[PDB]
Amino acid sequence: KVFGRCELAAAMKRHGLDNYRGYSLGNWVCAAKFESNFNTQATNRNTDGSTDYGILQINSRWWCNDGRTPGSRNLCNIPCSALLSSDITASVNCAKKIVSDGNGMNAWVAWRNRCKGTDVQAWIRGCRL
């Protein structure tokens, strides 16, 4: 599925991301925009044997198990295929873990490069929340 901006914002709000660990909703929407272009099926296969999965491009070395990645930790305790669903629940639950495991949103390269320091409220402006 390719989400709309406001539709994704509402889904992320329903799942408790607004102000999760001090990150406003627009940060999460911005991260998804630049990680995956709002596409739940996005995959990026890296040369290091790992793959980034889903709307938040969560990597298979630390966070989910795909059976193919060296050094797997599976800290979210999920198969990576769960991150390719049309429903965002598994991606949101794992994203919450990423931040709870002592990372901030700097764990997402697209957040740090394209969202940090910007007016991230723009990403939820105009939306029914």
The CATH number for 93's domain is 1.10.530.10
Q: What's the total number of domains in the chain?
A: 1
Q: CA distances (Å), 84 to each of 10, 22, 71, 78, 89, in order?
A: 19, 26, 22, 12, 10
Q: Which of 7, 18, 48, 52 is catalytic?
A: 52
Tell me which of 7, 18, 35, 48 is the catalytic residue.
Answer: 35
- The two three-digit tokens of residue 60, written as one number: 């298979």
Instruction: Please give the resolution of this entry in Å, rounded to 1 decimal.
Output: 0.9
Contact predicate 57/37, CB 8 Å: no
Residues within the annotated binding site?
A: 101
Annotated binding site for substrate: 101
Residue 119 designated active-site? no
Residue numbers of the domain that contains 36: 1-129
- Terminal alpha carbon distance of the chain: 20
Query: Cα dihedral sign for 97, 92, 104, 25?
Result: negative
> Please, is 16 exposed, middle or buried when counting C-beta atoms within 10 Å of its C-beta (0-12, 13-18, 19+)?
exposed
As a whole number of angstroms, the distance between CA 28 and CA 68 comes to: 28
Is 48 a catalytic site residue?
Answer: no
**Cα separation of 123 and 6, whole Å?**
8
Q: Is 22 helix (H, G, I), strand (E, B) or coil?
A: coil
Residues 6 or more apart whose Cβ sits within 8 Å of residue 90? 78, 82, 83
Q: How far apart are CA 74 and CA 120, in angstroms?
A: 30
